[PDB]
Structure 1
């Protein structure tokens, strides 16, 4: 019971906003979101401006 309580309910009462806690939170929280936004936005911009050029090999691509 002590183990499960410490692993779930006792965690927030013992939290302090610290340089380490804040920096780790920002990193592991919003870093990946912006990484993936950059990746997907870049890929889709490439693909769209490639379609505008008439250059993508879209034959047979009826289903989407």
Structure 2
């Protein structure tokens, strides 16, 4: 249960032409340490993956949004739905409890509080 998580799979020898998946990263950790080792810096680093981490997450959706797919009209099943339910639960109570407070006395007489 969650998950296999595929600690072995097919391989060998295909996709041994795939190389320079590290050249992508090896460039940076060379450049990053070329950044990170300097005598005079005293300050944080740009780290763009973080700039594009929030700004492509918090903002930049209602701009990207379109009110079309009915899996984006899904939310009526989520947002409004249970909010009706909680009305259905309560409004029955506060009444069932009220009717008895009139005809018949459920409480004791040492309840002043309330």
Gaps of 5+ in 2: 1-50
SS of equivalent to 1:34:
helix
Normalized per residue, the structure richer in helix is 1
Deviations 1:15-52 (A, max 9, x none): 11124245422121111111000001011110001112
Q: Which moved more, 1:35-44 or 1:20-29?
A: 20-29
TM-score, scaled relative to structure 1? 0.78
Structure 1 segments, 4+ long, off by >3 Å, are none
Residues matched between the structures, number: 64
Is residue 61 of structure 2 the alignment partner of residue 11 of structure 1?
Answer: yes
RMSD after superposition? 1.8
Match of 2:73 in 1: 23
Unaligned runs of 5+ in 1: none
Range moving further from structure 2, 29-38 or 49-58:
49-58
